[PDB]
């Protein structure tokens, strides 16, 4: 929901760095 918005935005950084 609305709150997940800030939490989702974090995954942006996740997708910014590499994790295998």
How would you summarize what this structure contains?
It is classed as antimicrobial protein. By secondary structure, the protein is mainly α.
What is the tally of helical segments? 1
Helix content: 55-70%
- Total beta strands: 0
Question: In whole angstroms, how far apart are the ends?
Answer: 28 Å
Radius of gyration: 10 Å
Secondary-structure element string: H
Biggest sheet statistics = none
Describe the protein.
The PDB classes it as antimicrobial protein. The protein is mainly alpha-helical. Helix content is 65%, strand content 0%. It has one helix at residues 4-16. The longest helix is centred in the middle third of the chain and has 13 residues, at 4-16. The chain is elongated.
Which structural traits does this protein have?
monomer; 20 residues; mainly alpha
Describe the secondary structure blueprint for this structure.
Blueprint lengths: L3 H13 L4
């Amino acid at each position: 929901r609305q709150y997940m918005r800030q939490i989702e935005q974090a995954l942006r950084y996740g997708y910014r760095i590499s994790r295998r």
